[PDB]
Write a protein that binds this ligand. Structure first.
Ligand SMILES: *[C@@H]1O[C@H](CO)[C@@H](O)[C@H](O)[C@H]1NC(C)=O
Lengths: 49, 50
């Protein structure tokens, strides 16, 4: 406690890093809000997916 | 509006378990400091005390 607010600063930096990682994942994966479903019948011109 | 990760400042009482080996008998301190014949500085005696 004589040293000061080092631990709070490190915890804040790590929390910001984790929030930034979650933001990166959300901004790289949640591009579209409409969850489209694949059709049950697959006849895409002979292309096999 | 958010979620914060913080520390703790609480205090708790103490419960202790003490494990000490099976030992009963004294070891000689009242005769090494009370001996009449003491060794010299070149030929200092060395006694293992257990
Ligand atoms: C040496 O002997 C005296 C009495 O003879 C005793 O009071 C003293 O405690 C002894 N020394 C040690 C280190 O026990």
């Amino acid at each position: 406690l004589q040293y000061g607010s080092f631990c709070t600063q490190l915890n804040r930096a790590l929390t910001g890093i984790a929030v930034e990682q979650d933001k990166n994942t959300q901004e790289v994966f949640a591009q579209v809000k409409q969850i489209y479903k694949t059709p049950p019948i697959k006849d895409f011109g002979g292309f096999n997916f | 509006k958010g979620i914060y990760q913080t520390s703790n400042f609480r205090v708790q009482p103490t419960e202790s378990i003490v494990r000490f080996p099976n030992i009963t008998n004294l070891c000689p301190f009242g005769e090494v400091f009370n001996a009449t014949r003491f060794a010299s500085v070149y030929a200092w005696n060395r006694k293992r005390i257990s």
